[PDB]
Design an enzyme around this catalytic site. Structure first.
Site, PDB file in Angstrom:
ATOM      1  N   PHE A  91     -82.652  -4.924 -16.392  1.00 23.53           N
ATOM      2  CA  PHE A  91     -83.683  -5.738 -17.341  1.00 23.53           C
ATOM      3  C   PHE A  91     -83.382  -7.380 -17.136  1.00 23.53           C
ATOM      4  O   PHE A  91     -84.309  -8.271 -16.497  1.00 23.53           O
ATOM      5  CB  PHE A  91     -83.898  -5.400 -18.569  1.00 23.53           C
ATOM      6  CG  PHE A  91     -84.833  -6.591 -19.353  1.00 23.53           C
ATOM      7  CD1 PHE A  91     -86.072  -6.648 -19.090  1.00 23.53           C
ATOM      8  CD2 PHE A  91     -84.206  -7.362 -20.488  1.00 23.53           C
ATOM      9  CE1 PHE A  91     -86.840  -7.441 -19.844  1.00 23.53           C
ATOM     10  CE2 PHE A  91     -84.918  -8.198 -21.100  1.00 23.53           C
ATOM     11  CZ  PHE A  91     -86.220  -8.270 -20.696  1.00 23.53           C
ATOM     12  N   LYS A  92     -82.135  -7.810 -17.260  1.00 25.87           N
ATOM     13  CA  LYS A  92     -81.806  -9.123 -17.374  1.00 25.87           C
ATOM     14  C   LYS A  92     -81.368  -9.466 -15.912  1.00 25.87           C
ATOM     15  O   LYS A  92     -81.558 -10.863 -15.623  1.00 25.87           O
ATOM     16  CB  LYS A  92     -80.355  -9.186 -18.096  1.00 25.87           C
ATOM     17  CG  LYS A  92     -80.601  -9.001 -19.473  1.00 25.87           C
ATOM     18  CD  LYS A  92     -79.341  -9.139 -20.478  1.00 25.87           C
ATOM     19  CE  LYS A  92     -79.488  -8.630 -21.833  1.00 25.87           C
ATOM     20  NZ  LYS A  92     -78.437  -8.771 -23.066  1.00 25.87           N
TER      21      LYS A  92
ATOM     22  N   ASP B 240     -63.181 -16.177 -29.588  1.00 28.94           N
ATOM     23  CA  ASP B 240     -63.615 -15.660 -28.132  1.00 28.94           C
ATOM     24  C   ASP B 240     -64.567 -16.799 -27.598  1.00 28.94           C
ATOM     25  O   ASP B 240     -65.816 -16.450 -27.653  1.00 28.94           O
ATOM     26  CB  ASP B 240     -64.370 -14.304 -28.549  1.00 28.94           C
ATOM     27  CG  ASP B 240     -65.321 -14.457 -29.877  1.00 28.94           C
ATOM     28  OD1 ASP B 240     -65.654 -15.071 -30.231  1.00 28.94           O
ATOM     29  OD2 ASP B 240     -65.871 -13.141 -29.935  1.00 28.94           O
TER      30      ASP B 240
ATOM     31  N   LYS C  56     -73.617 -15.059 -42.137  1.00 30.23           N
ATOM     32  CA  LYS C  56     -72.542 -14.087 -42.672  1.00 30.23           C
ATOM     33  C   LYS C  56     -72.071 -14.365 -44.115  1.00 30.23           C
ATOM     34  O   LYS C  56     -71.064 -14.505 -44.271  1.00 30.23           O
ATOM     35  CB  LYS C  56     -71.398 -14.281 -41.674  1.00 30.23           C
ATOM     36  CG  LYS C  56     -71.834 -14.299 -40.244  1.00 30.23           C
ATOM     37  CD  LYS C  56     -72.093 -12.874 -39.763  1.00 30.23           C
ATOM     38  CE  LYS C  56     -72.071 -12.837 -38.044  1.00 30.23           C
ATOM     39  NZ  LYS C  56     -72.646 -11.431 -37.807  1.00 30.23           N
TER      40      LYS C  56
ATOM     41  N   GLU D 234     -61.122 -12.069 -26.056  1.00 32.06           N
ATOM     42  CA  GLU D 234     -60.688 -12.350 -27.290  1.00 32.06           C
ATOM     43  C   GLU D 234     -59.463 -12.989 -27.199  1.00 32.06           C
ATOM     44  O   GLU D 234     -58.470 -12.240 -26.489  1.00 32.06           O
ATOM     45  CB  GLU D 234     -60.678 -11.057 -28.082  1.00 32.06           C
ATOM     46  CG  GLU D 234     -62.132 -10.627 -28.633  1.00 32.06           C
ATOM     47  CD  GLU D 234     -62.424  -9.313 -29.232  1.00 32.06           C
ATOM     48  OE1 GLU D 234     -61.487  -8.491 -29.309  1.00 32.06           O
ATOM     49  OE2 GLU D 234     -63.326  -9.459 -29.806  1.00 32.06           O
TER      50      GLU D 234
ATOM     51  N   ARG E  18     -79.748  -4.346 -38.353  1.00 34.67           N
ATOM     52  CA  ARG E  18     -79.433  -5.206 -39.641  1.00 34.67           C
ATOM     53  C   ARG E  18     -80.619  -5.296 -40.568  1.00 34.67           C
ATOM     54  O   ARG E  18     -81.706  -5.313 -40.025  1.00 34.67           O
ATOM     55  CB  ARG E  18     -78.957  -6.802 -39.070  1.00 34.67           C
ATOM     56  CG  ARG E  18     -78.045  -6.735 -38.232  1.00 34.67           C
ATOM     57  CD  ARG E  18     -77.492  -8.112 -37.458  1.00 34.67           C
ATOM     58  NE  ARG E  18     -76.193  -8.312 -36.878  1.00 34.67           N
ATOM     59  CZ  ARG E  18     -75.293  -8.347 -37.137  1.00 34.67           C
ATOM     60  NH1 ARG E  18     -74.578  -8.215 -38.480  1.00 34.67           N
ATOM     61  NH2 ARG E  18     -74.358  -8.608 -36.272  1.00 34.67           N
TER      62      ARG E  18
END
Lengths: 336, 5
Positions: free
Chosen positions: A304-305, A108, A36, A319, A211
């Site tokens: 899927f998972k 979080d 980051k 949070e 990204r």
DNA sequence: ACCA
């Protein structure tokens, strides 16, 4: 105390606490600040009577449309956050380090939601964001709150991925390998390029944002091949699908994936099988497939998972906001 | 913007 | 239609 990032001895002491804690998270490692690199890092810890670190918080400060920064400790702090008295002390340290530059400190942590824990946090003055913003979906929070996590400690004698699964799922896993899919893994520029091609291809296909490659290059430079591993599934020289997994603390985390257009020969199942195998081979407690929107067959993420995690999704506390500037907080954050 | 991470 |  606040960590002096230009002091290598302090930094190694901080990192050694992070790397050996059962609460450790990759996004709390100091290497995450290097990923980051558009955020500003501010890191604090607490010491016991002997001077050993017993709690640490890695924060990253980001810009807002106001005079104030947004301070964010992703999946932090690294400590038992249910020991709220200790949490107040560490957050107190974080607040002194921030010096009035941030409107909020948000963390979080990967700790289950409960009514009593939520009530305690609120009693100590934190603003929590979890079931009160659930109706806004998976992106009501920065990280998904519902997560699909495979508890490998339930299978102490499992030697291979197939030992974890009913016969029907064994078949599903066996399919790509039977049809010629092979998976290799590493953390070099070669694998990164293979990942990136599949990543950008999937991104354009689902019409979602993605990204730049330098994000992943920085992550490769920050973490060694025993921490970060890219898995690449091919069939007879044809690139099919990839995944990036990070091993840190008590878990191996499947963080990023890509897959080419058209027929993948179930290659994404083969990637999962090898990532799970890595977790078995290193005696890792948990394999974390990450977020879903909802525990429902209408959610393709969950479907899927759910092939790999038959237990219920883990639901975290979400949070937790230490509000520092309430006027800017009310401007920038809606409480559902 | 989108899965976190 | 699904394989983030």
């Amino acid at each position: 105390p606040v960590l002096n990032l230009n002091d290598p001895q302090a930094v190694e002491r901080y990192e050694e606490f992070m790397r050996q804690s059962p609460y450790g998270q990759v996004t709390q490692d100091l290497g995450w600040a290097k990923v980051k690199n558009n955020w500003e890092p501010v890191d604090v810890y607490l010491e016991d009577d002997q001077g050993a670190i017993i709690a640490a918080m890695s924060m990253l400060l980001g810009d807002t449309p106001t005079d104030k920064k947004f301070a964010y400790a992703s999946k932090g702090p690294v400590m038992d956050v249910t020991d709220v008295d200790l949490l107040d002390r560490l957050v107190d340290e974080a607040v002194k380090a921030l010096d009035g530059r941030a409107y909020v400190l948000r963390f979080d942590p990967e700790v289950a939601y409960s009514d009593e824990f939520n009530t305690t946090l609120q009693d100590h003055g934190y603003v929590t964001r979890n079931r009160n913003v659930a109706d806004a979906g998976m992106h009501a929070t920065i990280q998904p709150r519902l997560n699909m996590v495979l508890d490998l400690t339930k299978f102490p004698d499992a030697k291979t991925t197939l030992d974890l699964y009913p016969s029907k799922t064994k078949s599903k896993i066996k399919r790509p390998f039977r049809d010629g899919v092979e998976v290799h893994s590493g953390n070099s520029a070669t694998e990164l390029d293979e990942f990136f091609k599949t990543y950008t291809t999937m991104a354009e296909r689902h019409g979602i944002t993605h990204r730049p490659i330098e994000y992943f290059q920085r992550m490769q430079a920050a973490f060694d091949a025993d921490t970060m591993r890219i898995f690449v599934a091919e069939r007879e020289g044809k690139l099919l699908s990839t995944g990036i997994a990070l091993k840190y603390g008590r878990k191996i985390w499947y963080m990023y994936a890509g897959s080419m257009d058209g027929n993948t020969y179930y290659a994404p199942y083969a990637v999962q099988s090898e990532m799970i195998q890595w977790a078995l081979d290193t005696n890792t407690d948990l394999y974390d497939l990450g977020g879903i929107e909802s525990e429902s067959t209408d959610d393709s993420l969950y479907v899927f998972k759910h092939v790999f995690v038959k237990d219920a999704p883990r639901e975290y506390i979400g949070e937790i906001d230490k509000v520092l500037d309430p006027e800017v907080y009310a401007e920038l954050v809606k409480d559902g | 913007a989108x899965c976190x991470x």
